[PDB]
Design a protein around this ligand. Structure first.
Ligand SMILES: C[C@@H]1COc2c1ccc1c2c(-c2ccc[nH]c2=O)c(C(=O)NS(C)(=O)=O)n1Cc1cc(F)ccc1F
Length: 563
């Protein structure tokens, strides 16, 4: 069937749309080539509609059915809990899209009678009605990139009331089931250092390793009605409260398999018969679907000792080499099996015989050295998008601060330390906002974090070595330097000068700022201060940080205040 059908009504914005990086003194201090930085808008939505609209041909076989039964037997061990209305309201982000039913995210979080009554009515409607398609809003996503222009991504989501109900029925399932089914292959259970460790250990565990990333073109559009029902069949293996079982059955048929599309103006926009990007099960379902197809495809291809690492549609495979000609043919057989499963490739996959040449979750393993000169593996990425987005966020107040999430997730990198930390600490110190909590995203879930708490967060996610790395690989240094020239970012010597300046001001303030000066900026001085384990690090409650993926699932993971 067709992934989408369209009526001709346009994908519309609900406010004015900015596409150009503003000319601002603070953002200009970071990046001078402002014309290279753009934000996607609804103006390019029709180009995306063309790309994501196609017919799906899916043919399942014995390997697919065998893997499914193996996944279902593991899913059978799960006991999932129904969330109370209050527990589900607390998982809602403070700036989540308001309901069209007279209330917003703040009313949900405060447990307002109007919010609570509506949610209860939405819940009882899911229990009673197993068929009526649930309305969704289709919007063009506003995302920042560097030129060489990508058309806007399309986001599809139901009303706030429905989103709270999804949490009640499925939050516990989507948080616990993926690891029970996929074990060590489920990427979202790993902190950055655990992911690098898993990748390095799997690579080294093979006699002669061969690895590859597999890029599925428009993954969400390739997801069929059968895939979505297969996904529910795995959910159905859980021990469930009867209402959770009914809500999952009703959500599958009324929302997950497809439904009508409405624009911001309230016009009938079209019909969806594929994955919605903005529902609770997108990350979980995409991971299960990708793992299922890839595991079955590996058996059909005759790839030897396949270890998958899956995060939604992002897939990496590390196996035992059978020889170069054999590996090349087995990879072509893997692609042919994935294509039959309705997962054709975007960029054709290529076998890799070096771990550092593989990009997975837009990241590659690199090596640096700690204070002792000992080799440390860490994950890095091309810094182009992080720097373009950090520049956008310096010029405009955004609900999500990708710069903060990038400092957290990429703390050991030369670019997060020298540029990102330097730039934002300079600005926040000058604005007396170092201790002001900001929202950022980790594996799609939102968190409220004070930049002054960064040293202890970093120590837990990466180890103390994140504050001591030096002698970065020449390939890594060159990619960073070339990106800076391309974007018109000041050279690293300027960043070292700015870091020495902010470090001195941070030390002068004492308290948490002096801790930031000591740990975050020790790289900027010859006279190194002593770096010991931070007392706050061991006390940090990082439960829920590296459990599951929640991209598009409208999940807020910071603590709720009492009432
Ligand atoms: C160890 C390295 C370092 O950082 C990561 C590592 C590994 C995986 C990571 C992140 C972050 C991440 C980066 C920065 C801020 N915050 C984050 O969470 C995400 C993420 O953004 N995931 S998501 C798509 O939003 O669910 N993923 C998963 C992911 C990333 C993709 F590029 C594509 C698909 C996919 F699954």
């Amino acid at each position: 069937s067709m992934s989408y059908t369209w009526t001709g009504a346009l994908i519309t914005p609900c406010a004015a749309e900015e596409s150009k990086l503003p000319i601002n003194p603070l953002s200009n201090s970071l990046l001078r080539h402002h014309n290279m930085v753009y934000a996607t808008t609804s103006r390019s939505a029709s180009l995306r509609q063309k790309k994501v609209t196609f017919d799906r041909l899916q043919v399942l076989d014995d390997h697919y059915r065998d893997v499914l039964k193996e996944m279902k037997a593991k899913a059978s061990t799960v006991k999932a809990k129904l969330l109370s209305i209050e527990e589900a309201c607390k998982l809602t982000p403070p700036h989540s899209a308001k309901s069209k039913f007279g209330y917003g995210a703040k009313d949900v979080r405060n447990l307002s009678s109007r919010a609570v009554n509506h949610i209860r009515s939405v819940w009882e409607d899911l229990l009673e009605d197993t068929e009526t398609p649930i309305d969704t809003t289709i919007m063009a996503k506003s995302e920042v990139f560097c030129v060489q222009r990508k058309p806007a991504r399309l986001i599809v989501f139901p009303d706030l009331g429905v989103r709270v109900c999804e949490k009640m029925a499925l939050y516990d399932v989507v948080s616990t089931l993926p690891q029970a089914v996929m074990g060590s292959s489920y990427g979202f259970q790993y902190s950055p250092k655990q992911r690098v460790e898993f990748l390095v250990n799997t690579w080294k565990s093979k006699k002669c390793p061969m690895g590859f990333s597999y890029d599925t073109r428009c993954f969400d559009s390739t997801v069929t009605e059968s895939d979505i029902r297969v996904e529910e069949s795995i959910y159905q293996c859980c021990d469930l409260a009867p209402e959770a079982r009914q809500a999952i059955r009703s959500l599958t048929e009324r929302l997950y398999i497809g439904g009508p599309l409405t624009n911001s103006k309230g016009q009938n926009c079209g019909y969806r018969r594929c994955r919605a990007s903005g529902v609770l099960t997108t990350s979980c379902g995409n991971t299960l679907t990708c793992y299922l197809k890839a595991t079955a495809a590996c058996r059909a291809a005759k790839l030897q000792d396949c270890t998958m690492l899956v995060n939604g549609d992002d897939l990496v495979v590390i196996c035992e080499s059978a020889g170069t000609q054999e590996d090349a043919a087995a990879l072509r057989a893997f692609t042919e099996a994935m294509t039959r499963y309705s997962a054709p490739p975007g960029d054709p996959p290529q076998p890799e015989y070096d771990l550092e040449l593989i990009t997975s979750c837009s990241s590659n393993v690199s090596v640096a050295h700690d204070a002792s000169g000992k080799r440390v593996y860490y994950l890095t990425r091309d810094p182009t998008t992080p720097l373009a987005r950090a520049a956008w966020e310096t010029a405009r107040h955004t609900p999500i601060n990708s710069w903060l999430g990038n400092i957290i997730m990429y703390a050991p990198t030369l670019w997060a330390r020298m540029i990102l930390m330097t730039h934002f600490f300079s600005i926040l110190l000058a604005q007396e906002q170092l201790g002001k909590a900001l929202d950022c995203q980790i594996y799609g879930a939102c968190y409220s974090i004070e930049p002054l708490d960064l040293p202890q967060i970093i120590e837990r996610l990466h180890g103390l070595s994140a504050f001591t790395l030096h002698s970065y690989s020449p390939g890594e240094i060159n990619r960073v330097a070339s990106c800076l020239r391309k974007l018109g970012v000041p050279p690293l010597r300027t960043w070292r000068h700015r870091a020495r300046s902010v470090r001195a001001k941070l030390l002068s303030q004492g308290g948490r700022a002096a801790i930031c000066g000591r740990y975050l900026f020790n790289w900027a001085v010859r006279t190194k201060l002593k770096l010991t384990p931070i007392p706050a690090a061991s006390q940090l409650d990082l439960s829920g940080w590296f459990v599951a993926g929640y991209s598009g699932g409208d999940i807020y993971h910071s603590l709720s205040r009492a009432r």
